[PDB]
Amino acid sequence: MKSVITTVVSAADAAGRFPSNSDLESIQGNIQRSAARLEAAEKLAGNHEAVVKEAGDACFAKYAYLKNPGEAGENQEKINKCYRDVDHYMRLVNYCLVVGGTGPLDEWGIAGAREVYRTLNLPTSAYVASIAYTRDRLCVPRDMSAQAGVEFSAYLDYLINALS
Amino acid sequence: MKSVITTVVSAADAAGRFPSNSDLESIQGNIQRSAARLEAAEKLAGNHEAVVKEAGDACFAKYAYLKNPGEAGENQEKINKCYRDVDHYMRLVNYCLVVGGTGPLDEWGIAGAREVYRTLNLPTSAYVASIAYTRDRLCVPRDMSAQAGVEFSAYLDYLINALS
Amino acid sequence: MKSVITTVVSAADAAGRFPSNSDLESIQGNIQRSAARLEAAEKLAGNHEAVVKEAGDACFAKYAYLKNPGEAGENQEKINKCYRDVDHYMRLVNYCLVVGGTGPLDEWGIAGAREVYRTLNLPTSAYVASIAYTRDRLCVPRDMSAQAGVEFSAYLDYLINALS
Amino acid sequence: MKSVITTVVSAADAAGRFPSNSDLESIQGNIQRSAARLEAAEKLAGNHEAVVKEAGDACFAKYAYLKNPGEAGENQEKINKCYRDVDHYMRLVNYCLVVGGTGPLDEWGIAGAREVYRTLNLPTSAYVASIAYTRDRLCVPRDMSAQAGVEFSAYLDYLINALS
Amino acid sequence: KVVDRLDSQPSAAFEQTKQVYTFSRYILGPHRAVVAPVAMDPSEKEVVLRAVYRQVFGNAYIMEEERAELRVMESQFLLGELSVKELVRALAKSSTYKVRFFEGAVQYRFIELCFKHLLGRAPDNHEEIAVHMRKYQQEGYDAEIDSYLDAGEYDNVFGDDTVPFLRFRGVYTPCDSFNRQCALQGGWANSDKAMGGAALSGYNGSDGRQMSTMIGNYISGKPIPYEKVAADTPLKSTAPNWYARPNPALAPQPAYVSAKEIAELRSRVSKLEAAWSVAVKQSAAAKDTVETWRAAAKEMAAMRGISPMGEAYFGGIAQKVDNGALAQLGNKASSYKKYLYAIETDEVSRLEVDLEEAKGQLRVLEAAMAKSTPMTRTAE
Amino acid sequence: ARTAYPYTGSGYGSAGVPYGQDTYGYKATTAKSITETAAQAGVFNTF
Amino acid sequence: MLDAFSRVVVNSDAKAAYVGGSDLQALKSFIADGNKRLDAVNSIVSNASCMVSDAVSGMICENPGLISPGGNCYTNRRMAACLRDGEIILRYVSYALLAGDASVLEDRCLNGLKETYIALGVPTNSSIRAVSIMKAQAVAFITNTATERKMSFAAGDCTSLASEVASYFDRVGAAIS
Amino acid sequence: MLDAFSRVVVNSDAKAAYVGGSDLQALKSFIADGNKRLDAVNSIVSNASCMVSDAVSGMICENPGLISPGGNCYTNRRMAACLRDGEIILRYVSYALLAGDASVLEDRCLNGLKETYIALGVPTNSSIRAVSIMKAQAVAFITNTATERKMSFAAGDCTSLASEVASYFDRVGAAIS
Ligand SMILES: C=CC1=C(C)[C@@H](Cc2[nH]c(/C=C3N=C(/C=C4\NC(=O)[C@H](C)[C@H]4CC)C(C)=C\3CCC(=O)O)c(CCC(=O)O)c2C)NC1=O
Ligand SMILES: C=CC1=C(C)[C@@H](Cc2[nH]c(/C=C3N=C(/C=C4\NC(=O)[C@H](C)[C@H]4CC)C(C)=C\3CCC(=O)O)c(CCC(=O)O)c2C)NC1=O
Ligand SMILES: C=CC1=C(C)[C@@H](Cc2[nH]c(/C=C3N=C(/C=C4\NC(=O)[C@H](C)[C@H]4CC)C(C)=C\3CCC(=O)O)c(CCC(=O)O)c2C)NC1=O
Ligand SMILES: C=CC1=C(C)[C@@H](Cc2[nH]c(/C=C3N=C(/C=C4\NC(=O)[C@H](C)[C@H]4CC)C(C)=C\3CCC(=O)O)c(CCC(=O)O)c2C)NC1=O
Ligand SMILES: C=CC1=C(C)[C@@H](Cc2[nH]c(/C=C3N=C(/C=C4\NC(=O)[C@H](C)[C@H]4CC)C(C)=C\3CCC(=O)O)c(CCC(=O)O)c2C)NC1=O
Ligand SMILES: C=CC1=C(C)[C@@H](Cc2[nH]c(/C=C3N=C(/C=C4\NC(=O)[C@H](C)[C@H]4CC)C(C)=C\3CCC(=O)O)c(CCC(=O)O)c2C)NC1=O
Ligand SMILES: C=CC1=C(C)[C@@H](Cc2[nH]c(/C=C3N=C(/C=C4\NC(=O)[C@H](C)[C@H]4CC)C(C)=C\3CCC(=O)O)c(CCC(=O)O)c2C)NC1=O
Ligand SMILES: C=CC1=C(C)[C@@H](Cc2[nH]c(/C=C3N=C(/C=C4\NC(=O)[C@H](C)[C@H]4CC)C(C)=C\3CCC(=O)O)c(CCC(=O)O)c2C)NC1=O
Ligand SMILES: C=CC1=C(C)[C@@H](Cc2[nH]c(/C=C3N=C(/C=C4\NC(=O)[C@H](C)[C@H]4CC)C(C)=C\3CCC(=O)O)c(CCC(=O)O)c2C)NC1=O
Ligand SMILES: C=CC1=C(C)[C@@H](Cc2[nH]c(/C=C3N=C(/C=C4\NC(=O)[C@H](C)[C@H]4CC)C(C)=C\3CCC(=O)O)c(CCC(=O)O)c2C)NC1=O
Ligand SMILES: C=CC1=C(C)[C@@H](Cc2[nH]c(/C=C3N=C(/C=C4\NC(=O)[C@H](C)[C@H]4CC)C(C)=C\3CCC(=O)O)c(CCC(=O)O)c2C)NC1=O
Ligand SMILES: C=CC1=C(C)[C@@H](Cc2[nH]c(/C=C3N=C(/C=C4\NC(=O)[C@H](C)[C@H]4CC)C(C)=C\3CCC(=O)O)c(CCC(=O)O)c2C)NC1=O
Ligand SMILES: C=CC1=C(C)[C@@H](Cc2[nH]c(/C=C3N=C(/C=C4\NC(=O)[C@H](C)[C@H]4CC)C(C)=C\3CCC(=O)O)c(CCC(=O)O)c2C)NC1=O
Ligand SMILES: C=CC1=C(C)[C@@H](Cc2[nH]c(/C=C3N=C(/C=C4\NC(=O)[C@H](C)[C@H]4CC)C(C)=C\3CCC(=O)O)c(CCC(=O)O)c2C)NC1=O
C-alpha cells in the first residue's frame, strides 16, 4: 500500500540509505493530518448503511435504462450485487482514510477494473454517478468537521478520476 | 538535492502518478519541523566565525604531527586551506539545515571526497576530529533550543559517519 | 592471482582461442626474469625478522602521537598487532615476488583495505611510512643483486601507490 | 593485430590499469624469441620465388582433376590466380613472423575465407596441400636454424589447422 | 590509483554500488539501478514493469491494446519464474518490439537501438557493429538478441535482476562513445519513434521508415557535434543543478545575426587568449608582495613564544591572547576566506572566465551563420 | 605590460590608458530612443 | 531537480555565503502560506481528469483540421497520444507548483520537447492552445471561479499561487514554441 | 590499435611490399633499446600516483578560479573527476610509450574528447597546463632528474624515449585544444 511510510523507506531502500532527517520529517505530517483524516474514518464506518443506500438508488435514478431486460440491472440479484459494489468502494475509501494514502484503492478497486467493467458490460458512468452523489452531499459542519470533509472528498474525487 | 519535496515527487514521477495524499502529507511535516531546523540555521550563520576557529585548532591539538615537514599542514598556506575546509563543511551543514535534507552535503562534500583525501594525503581522522569537537560542545539550552540542537547534531554526525 | 600465466590464458579463454605464439612468447620472459625476481624471494624470506623490526619502530618514530591514549597504538597489544601487519605486508610482497605479478597483494592486502583502515581509524600514512623506510634502505649490491633490487623496489612502491 | 604487445595493453586497458610488472615481463620474451623468429623472416623473404613455385605444382600434382573443364583451375588465368593465393599466404606468414603473433593471418587470410572458398568452389584441401608440402620440406639445419624452423612450422600448421 | 575497478568488471564483495557510480552522473538523475527484491508485493512488481517498459521500448506510449500482446510473458514474471533478463529477452523477441524497431529499420539503426535498449550503451567502434551484422545475416534475429544478452558484458553489469539503465561509467575507452550515448538517448521527452523519423515518414503515423543519422560517425572516426550533446541530452536530465562558472547549456541561436558582431567577438577572443598566455608565466613567481619578506619575518616573529595563558603584559597591563594554530601566526577568519572570491578577484582567473564565455557566445553565432540567401538582416 | 585589465588615468599612478579609455569621464548619449531604434532596425515595422 | 528551499542554497553557494536572516524572509513566508499551496494543488489534482478532455476538445472545436483525414489527431492512436501528452504536461506543472520552483518542469518535461514535436510533425499552434486552455482552467480552479464546480475552502486571497501557475504555463508554451 | 611492429606492416601493406631488410633496421634498433624502454616505463608507473596530485595542484596554484565558487573544480565531485581524467590521460600515455606507437592514445582517449570538454564546459587552458606539468614530470623521471627521488639505473643515454613521451604529451594537448 502506498502511504506516507512505505514511500519514504522504499526511496531509502532503493538508494541503500539509512532513514535520514527527510524520512523522519515526512512522518511528522502523518502525526498532524491523522487527527483530521481519522475523524472521517469512524464517521463513515458507523453510518455506512445510509450512504450505500442513498448512492445506489441515485445511480438507478440517473440511469433508469439499466433495469431493462438485457441490461446490467435487469433482475433482483444483479441489483443486489450492484449495491455490494458501492459497499466495496466505500469500504476501500474507509481503508484509504486509515492508511493515509491511496494504497488499498489502487490495489483492490482500481487495478484491473477497466477490464472487468468492459468485459461484463458494467457502465463506468453509473459507477461514478453514485460516488459523485456521495461527493456533493457533504454538509461540511454536519457530516464531519472541515478538514475531515476535505480528506474525505479528496479520496472520493480520486476514485472518480481513476474510474474515468 | 534530496529533501522532503524532491523525494516524494520523484517517487510520483517514476510511477507516473499525480501527487496523492501521501505526497501532500509528507510536506506537512516540513511545516512542523522547519520551526526547529531553521532556528539553528541563523544561529550557525551568525556565529560561524567562532566555530571554525574553535574546530581548527582542536584538529591540530589532537594531531600535532601534521605541522611536521612532509606532512599535510607543514606550512602556513596549507593551514589556511585547512581552516577553509572546515568553513566549507559548516557552510554545507548550514545549507542542509535549510533544505531539510542531506542534499547539499551529499552533492558538494561527500561525493568524491574519499578519492581526493587519499590522493592528496589528507587524513580523514583529522577531518572528523573537528566535527566531533563541534558536536560535543553543544550546550543544549545555551547554543540553541533543544530540537534545533537535535537537528544540528543529527547533521553533524551524518557527516562524521559519511567521512568514516 | 594476476601473473604472466593467468594473463595470456584469460586473454585467450575470453576469445575462445588455443594458446598462440604470443601466449608462448609471453612465458619466455617468465624464464628470463625469474632468475632475478626469485633471488630476492629467499633473501626476504630468510631475513624477514630484521626488516619488520626495523620498519615498525620507524613507523612510530615518524608518528610518536600514536602511543597517546585514544589513538591506534595506545597499549601494548595494539603495537603487537601493528607489527603483525607489517609482517603480513612483507609476506605478501614475498608471495608477489614468487608469483611474478601483483596477484597476492591485490587479493589479500589491497582489496578492501581502504574500508577497514577508515573504519578502525588506522592512518594509512603510518602504513606507507614503514614501506618507504624499507624502500630507501636497499643497498643495491649488499642486500641483493641489482635486478633483484629493482624487482623488490617495484613491488614495494606498488603497495605504496595502492595504499595512497 | 594480436601480438605480445597488443594483448597485454588491452588487458590493462579493459581493467583501467597502468602497465604492471607482468606487462613489462611479457615483452621481455619478445626480446629473446625475436632473434629466432626474425631469422626466418628474411629467409622466407629472400627465397619466396621458389617456395610458391614448389608449392603450386605440388597442389596440382596431388589433385590433377582441377584442370578439367568446369573445375577451379580449368584455364591459365585461374592457375595464375591460384599461384597468387599461395604467394598471399606466404606473405601473411612472413608478416606473422615479424609481428610475433597470428595477427595478420587472422585479419587478412583467415577471417571470411570459409565463405569465399565455398561460394567460389575453391577446395580447401588443395589449399592445405601446398602448405603441408611446404611444411614437410623444412631441412632444419639447411633452410634455417632450429628455433627459426620451429617458429616457421608453428605458423604454417596454424594456417593448416585454421583452413581445416 | 583513484579508480580501482571499472563497471565492466563484476562488482566487488565490499561495495554496495560500483565505485565508478558514486561520483559520476549516476547519483543525480533517474538513470539508476532498479533491483527487483526477492519477494514482491503485486504493488511493487509494477514498479519494476514500468521501468522495464520505459527502458526496453525506450520511451513508448503503448496503449493497453498493445499490452494484451505481452500479457502472457509478463505473467511468467509476475509468478516469479522469469528473471528480469529473461523478461527483456522475451520482450525483445515479441512482435511489438519487431514492428517498432526492426520492421522499418536500416540495420545500423536496429543494431544501435538494441545497444541502447538491452544494454546501457552506445555502439563503441565499428568492429563490434560488423560482428553483430554478420551475426544476424547468418542466424537470424532470434540468435541476434542472444548475442547481446548471453555474453560477458550483461551479467557482470546488470546481473539477472537489475533493469537496464543508461550507464554513466566515467571511464570511456573510445571517448566519443560518451557523446554517442548522450546523442542516442535524447533526454527525457524524446523517443525512438520520434528520433528515428518513423512517424512523419509513416502513413497515419504507422508504417514508418526507422531511418538513422550518425552512421557516418560509426564508420569514419568522426565524432559527434557538440549541439546534440549539450542541447537535448541526459546531461541536463541528470544535471547537478548548480552554479557553473561557464554555463555549459547552450543558448538558443539568435535570429538576425550579422557578420560585424562576429568579427568584433573573434577579435575579442584573440586578444583574450594572448593576454592569458602571458599572464600565466607571471603567476606563481611574482604573485605576492610579502613573499620575499616571508622568509625574513619568520625569525623576528620566533621570539617571545610561550605556552600557558596570560603572557605579553607589555608593561603593567595583564591581558593577552595568542595560543591558536591559525592565530599563532596572525591570521584571522578572513585569511582563509580569500579563496572564495578568486573567480572575480584573481587577475589570472578573470581572463579565463571571459575567454570561455566569449567562446560560448562565439560558437552559437556561426551556427546561425549557416543560412545565407532568403535571410533578412537588421541594424542591431 | 601586466594586469590584462589596465586602467584609466594620468600622472603618477597611471598605466598608459586615458581616463575613461578616451579621457571622457561622462560620455554623451549615442543610442536612439525606443521607436527610433525600432524604426531603424528594419524588423519592427508593424510594431 | 530543485525546490524553493534549495533554490536559495544554490544562490548562496555561488558566493560562499551562509544563508542569513535576509534570505529567510522569503522562505518563512513560503511556510506561512504553505497550507494555501497544498489547498491549491489539491484543487488542481482533483479535476485533472476533466482538465485534459476539457482542453483537448477545446483545441478540436477550434482547429477541425486535426481530426481531418491526414491530420495530426486523426487516428485513435494519435488522439490517445495527444490526450497522453496533455496529462504529462499537467502532471509536471502540478509538480512545479507543489515544489514552488520550475526546475523539475524544464529538465524532465521541456528539455528536448521542441525537437520531439518538430521531428514528429506535431503542429505547434494547437500545442499552444491546448496549454493555454489548461492555464485558464488552472486560474479558475485555484481562485474557485469554475462555472459548475465549487470547492470548500477557508476564506482568503490566492492570486499569488494563481499567478505562479500562470507563470509555469507560459514557460511550457515558450518551451514548445 | 597498433604498436611499433605493426606500424611498418600497414605501411608495407599499402604497397603490397614484403617487409625487407631496409624496413628491419628500424625494428632491430627497437629491440636493442627495448630494455631502456621497459626501464623508462617502470619509472613513470612507479611515481604515477604522485604525478597526478603534483600536476593538478600545480594547475590550482596557477589559477585559484577553479576552486572559486562556481568554478570547474569547485565541488569535491568535480575535483575527484579532474583527478580521474588526469590519471586516465597518464594511463594512455604510458600505454603509448610502452607500445612505441601513438595509435592507442588517439582512438581510445583523445577521439571525441574535445567536444566532450566543450559540452561539459571544462576550461581548456587549465587542461593544457595539467598535461604540460605531467610532461615536465615525465622528462624528469625518464632522465632521472627529479629533485627528491632518484632511481637506480644502468648508465647510458635516454633522451630518445624522453623525446618520444614529450611527443605524445603535446599530441594529447593538441587533441584537447
Ligand atoms: C459519514 C458521513 C455522512 C454524510 C455525508 C451524511 C450523508 C447523508 N445525509 C443524509 C440525510 C440528510 N443530509 C442532510 C444534509 C444536507 N442536506 C442539504 O440539502 C444540505 C446540502 C446538507 C446540509 C448542509 C439533510 C438535511 C438530511 C435529511 C433530509 C435529506 O435527506 O435531505 C443521507 C440519506 C440517509 C439519511 O437520512 O441518513 C446520507 C447518506 N451523513 C453522514 O453521516
Ligand atoms: C473489491 C472490489 C470489488 C468490486 C468493485 C466489484 C466489481 C465486480 N462486479 C461484478 C459483477 C456485477 N457488478 C454489478 C454492478 C453494477 N452494475 C451496474 O449496472 C452498476 C454500475 C453497478 C451497480 C450499482 C452487476 C449488476 C454485476 C453482475 C454482472 C454479471 O454477473 O455478469 C464482478 C464479477 C463477480 C461478481 O459477481 O461479484 C466484480 C469483480 N466486486 C469486487 O469484489
Ligand atoms: C551556533 C551555535 C553555537 C555553539 C555550539 C556554541 C559554540 C561555542 N561556544 C564557545 C564558548 C563557550 N561555550 C561554552 C558552553 C559550554 N561550556 C561547557 O563547558 C559546557 C559543556 C557548555 C554549556 C553547557 C562556555 C561556557 C564558553 C565560554 C568559555 C569556554 O570556551 O568554555 C566557543 C568558542 C569561541 C567562543 O567563545 O565563542 C564556540 C565555538 N556557541 C554558539 O553560538
Ligand atoms: C566544497 C567542499 C570542499 C572541501 C572539503 C575542500 C577539500 C579540498 N582540500 C584541498 C586541499 C587541502 N586541504 C587541506 C586540509 C587539511 N589538511 C589536513 O591535514 C586537515 C585534515 C585539513 C585542515 C583542517 C590541506 C592542507 C590542503 C592542501 C593540500 C595540497 O595542496 O596538496 C583540495 C584541493 C584543492 C584546494 O587546494 O582547495 C580540496 C578539493 N575543498 C572544497 O572545495
Ligand atoms: C632482505 C633484504 C635486506 C635488506 C634491504 C637489508 C635491510 C637491513 N639492513 C640493516 C642494517 C644495515 N644496513 C646497512 C646498509 C646501508 N646503510 C647505509 O647507510 C647505506 C644506505 C646502505 C648500504 C649501501 C648497514 C651499513 C647496516 C648496519 C648498520 C646500520 O643499521 O646502518 C637492517 C637493520 C637490522 C639489521 O641490522 O639487519 C635492515 C632491515 N638487509 C637485508 O638482508
Ligand atoms: C592479510 C593482511 C592483513 C593486514 C594488513 C592486517 C590489517 C588489519 N589490522 C587490524 C587491526 C589493527 N591494525 C593495527 C595496526 C596499526 N595501527 C597503526 O597505527 C599502524 C598504522 C599499524 C601498526 C604499524 C592496530 C593497532 C589494530 C587494532 C585496532 C583495533 O583492534 O581496533 C585488523 C582487524 C582485525 C585484527 O585485529 O587483526 C585488520 C584486518 N590484518 C590482516 O589480516
Ligand atoms: C626459406 C626457407 C627455405 C626452405 C624450406 C627450403 C625450401 C626448398 N628447398 C628446395 C630444394 C631442395 N631442398 C632440399 C632439402 C632437402 N631435401 C631432402 O630430401 C631433405 C628432406 C631436405 C634436407 C634435409 C634439397 C636437397 C634440394 C635440392 C634438390 C631437391 O629439390 O630435393 C626447393 C625447391 C626449389 C629450389 O630448388 O630452391 C624449396 C622451395 N629452401 C629455403 O630457402
Ligand atoms: C589476401 C588474401 C587473399 C587470398 C587467399 C586470395 C583468395 C581469393 N581467391 C580468389 C579467386 C581464385 N582463387 C583461386 C585459387 C585456387 N583454386 C584452386 O583450385 C586452388 C585451391 C587455388 C590455387 C592453388 C582460383 C582458381 C580463383 C578464380 C575463381 C574465380 O574467378 O571464380 C578470390 C576472388 C577474387 C580474385 O580473383 O582474386 C579471392 C578473394 N585472394 C586474396 O586477396
Ligand atoms: C517526458 C515527456 C513526454 C511528453 C511531453 C510526451 C510527448 C510525446 N508525444 C509523442 C507522440 C505524439 N504526441 C502527439 C500529440 C499532439 N499532437 C497534436 O496534434 C496535438 C497538438 C498534441 C496533443 C494535444 C501525437 C498525435 C503523437 C503521435 C504521433 C504519431 O503517432 O505519429 C512522443 C513520441 C513518442 C510516441 O510516438 O508516442 C512524445 C515524446 N511523451 C513524453 O514521454
Ligand atoms: C469550441 C469548443 C469548446 C469546448 C469543448 C469548451 C471547452 C473549454 N472550457 C473552457 C473553460 C473551462 N473548462 C473547464 C473544465 C471543466 N469544467 C468543469 O467544470 C469540469 C470540472 C471540467 C471538465 C469536465 C473549467 C473549470 C473552465 C473555467 C470556467 C468554468 O467552467 O467554471 C475553455 C477556455 C475558455 C472558454 O473558451 O470558455 C474551453 C475552450 N469550450 C469551447 O469553446
Ligand atoms: C494533507 C493535505 C493538506 C491540505 C489540502 C491542506 C489543507 C488546508 N488548507 C488550509 C487553509 C487555507 N487554504 C486557503 C486557500 C484558499 N482559500 C480560498 O478561498 C482560495 C479559493 C484558496 C486559495 C488557493 C486559505 C486562504 C487558507 C487559510 C489561510 C491559511 O491557513 O494559510 C488549512 C489550514 C486551516 C485548517 O484547515 O485548519 C489546511 C489544513 N493542508 C494539508 O496539510
Ligand atoms: C576514456 C577517456 C575518458 C576521459 C579523458 C575522462 C574525461 C571526462 N571527464 C568528465 C567529467 C569531468 N572532467 C572534469 C575535469 C576537469 N575539469 C577541469 O576544470 C580540469 C581542467 C579537469 C581536471 C584536471 C570535471 C571537473 C568533470 C565533472 C563535470 C561535472 O561533474 O559537471 C567526463 C564526463 C563524464 C562525467 O561526468 O564524469 C569525461 C568523459 N573520462 C573518460 O572516460
Ligand atoms: C604553484 C603551485 C605549485 C605546485 C603544487 C608545485 C607542483 C609542481 N611540480 C613541478 C615539478 C615536478 N613535480 C614532480 C612530482 C613529484 N615530485 C616528486 O618527487 C614526487 C615523486 C611527485 C609528487 C609526490 C617532479 C618529479 C617534478 C620535476 C622536478 C623534481 O621534483 O625533481 C611543476 C612543474 C615545474 C615547476 O613549476 O616546478 C609544478 C607546477 N610547483 C608549483 O609551482
Ligand atoms: C620485466 C621488467 C623489466 C625491466 C624494468 C627492464 C629492466 C632492465 N633495464 C636494463 C638496462 C638499461 N636501462 C637503461 C635506462 C636508463 N638508464 C639511465 O641511466 C637512464 C636514467 C634510463 C634511460 C631511460 C640503460 C641505459 C640500460 C643499459 C643499456 C641496455 O641494457 O639497453 C636491463 C639490462 C641490464 C640488466 O639489468 O641486466 C634490464 C633487465 N627489463 C625488464 O625485462
Side-chain angles (χ1 to χ4, degrees), chain B residues 72 78 81-82 84-85 88-89 108 117 122 126-127, chain H residues 74 76:
Chain B
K78 278 159 138 61
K81 275 167 68 90
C82 175
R84 187 217 49 189
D85 295 5
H88 277 336
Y89 275 133
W108 296 331
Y117 295 159
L122 306 176
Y127 264 111
Chain H
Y74 168 64
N76 276 321

Side-chain angles (χ1 to χ4, degrees), chain E residues 86-338:
Chain E
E86 314 302 322
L87 181 57
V88 312
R89 182 181 320 217
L91 276 171
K93 296 171 185 180
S94 183
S95 53
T96 174
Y97 190 81
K98 272 193 281 194
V99 293
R100 279 174 163 88
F101 307 117
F102 189 65
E103 296 296 19
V106 73
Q107 201 56 232
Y108 269 106
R109 182 63 181 169
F110 167 73
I111 290 312
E112 77 186 342
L113 269 184
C114 53
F115 266 118
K116 196 196 82 160
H117 293 324
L118 315 171
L119 284 87
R121 38 164 299 223
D124 223 324
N125 53 332
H126 189 46
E127 285 78 18
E128 68 162 27
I129 289 177
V131 62
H132 287 336
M133 296 208 171
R134 303 187 283 104
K135 194 61 157 47
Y136 156 71
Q137 275 137 10
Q138 323 289 307
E139 282 79 22
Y141 169 87
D142 50 297
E144 175 68 26
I145 304 303
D146 291 332
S147 165
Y148 285 93
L149 295 174
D150 306 318
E153 195 174 14
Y154 194 95
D155 283 87
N156 306 324
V157 174
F158 302 138
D160 64 326
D161 283 309
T162 310
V163 308
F165 53 91
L166 192 72
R167 290 201 261 143
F168 279 119
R169 283 100 59 91
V171 173
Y172 303 105
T173 157
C175 228
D176 75 76
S177 163
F178 173 72
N179 316 135
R180 283 171 183 177
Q181 293 177 335
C182 278
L184 212 44
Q185 277 211 7
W188 204 259
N190 269 324
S191 60
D192 308 344
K193 191 187 179 79
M195 290 169 73
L200 197 59
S201 87
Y203 296 117
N204 284 347
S206 79
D207 298 303
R209 322 195 295 271
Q210 193 81 230
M211 66 198 43
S212 158
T213 309
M214 85 201 281
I215 65 186
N217 298 83
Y218 292 136
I219 293 156
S220 168
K222 193 257 169 192
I224 300 298
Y226 67 100
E227 298 97 335
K228 319 210 288 180
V229 186
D232 186 19
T233 180
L235 282 179
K236 274 82 180 170
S237 314
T238 86
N241 260 138
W242 57 19
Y243 167 59
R245 179 81 255 185
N247 273 329
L250 55 91
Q253 48 99 18
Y256 311 131
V257 72
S258 279
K260 173 65 219 70
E261 61 204 297
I262 305 182
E264 81 185 350
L265 188 46
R266 204 188 277 108
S267 159
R268 184 151 71 196
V269 56
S270 284
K271 294 181 168 42
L272 290 173
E273 50 198 3
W276 183 82
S277 159
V278 60
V280 164
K281 301 293 179 67
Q282 306 189 7
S283 162
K287 207 195 303 279
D288 199 312
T289 42
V290 51
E291 192 49 58
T292 80
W293 317 107
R294 188 89 44 85
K298 296 172 189 168
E299 61 96 1
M300 277 91 82
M303 319 340 195
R304 187 102 72 281
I306 190 62
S307 41
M309 182 39 59
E311 207 72 12
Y313 289 86
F314 210 92
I317 327 308
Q319 300 314 331
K320 230 86 207 172
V321 49
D322 58 64
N323 283 3
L326 178 78
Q328 273 160 17
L329 307 102
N331 268 10
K332 303 174 295 307
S334 68
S335 279
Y336 52 86
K337 290 211 154 208
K338 61 170 183 296

Side-chain angles (χ1 to χ4, degrees), chain B residues 27-140:
Chain B
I27 311 172
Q28 192 48 242
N30 213 342
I31 307 195
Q32 274 66 239
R33 205 54 173 158
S34 64
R37 73 169 164 84
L38 284 185
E39 191 250 311
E42 58 272 3
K43 193 61 83 199
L44 183 72
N47 205 23
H48 83 239
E49 249 149 22
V51 189
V52 182
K53 199 50 73 178
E54 183 178 2
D57 37 21
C59 166
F60 289 112
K62 198 171 259 325
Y63 306 110
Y65 81 105
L66 298 166
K67 289 155 179 183
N68 298 348
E71 291 310 314
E74 44 190 351
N75 44 69
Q76 173 62 31
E77 50 280 35
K78 278 159 138 61
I79 306 176
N80 277 347
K81 275 167 68 90
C82 175
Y83 276 74
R84 187 217 49 189
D85 295 5
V86 201
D87 188 87
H88 277 336
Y89 275 133
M90 292 315 181
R91 194 164 48 90
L92 295 187
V93 172
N94 165 255
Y95 292 161
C96 289
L97 282 162
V98 170
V99 175
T102 66
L105 258 185
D106 290 332
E107 306 284 72
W108 296 331
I110 303 302
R114 300 195 286 99
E115 279 80 31
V116 291
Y117 295 159
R118 189 189 67 252
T119 317
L120 310 175
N121 289 337
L122 306 176
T124 39
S125 45
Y127 264 111
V128 314
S130 45
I131 313 296
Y133 183 73
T134 302
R135 197 190 57 198
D136 289 345
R137 198 177 160 83
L138 195 74
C139 262
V140 71

Side-chain angles (χ1 to χ4, degrees), chain E residues 59 61 188-191 193-194 199 205, chain G residues 59 66 72-73 77-78 81-82 85 88 108-109 113 116-117 120 122-123 126-127:
Chain E
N59 209 24
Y61 271 156
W188 204 259
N190 269 324
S191 60
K193 191 187 179 79
Chain G
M59 183 203 56
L66 302 178
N72 210 238
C73 284
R77 206 259 301 156
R78 297 204 259 195
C82 197
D85 261 52
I88 292 183
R108 289 195 188 168
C109 190
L113 176 38
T116 308
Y117 278 172
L120 285 171
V122 173
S126 323
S127 308

Side-chain angles (χ1 to χ4, degrees), chain H residues 66-80:
Chain H
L66 302 178
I67 62 181
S68 171
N72 210 238
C73 284
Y74 168 64
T75 308
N76 276 321
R77 206 259 301 156
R78 297 204 259 195
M79 198 61 174

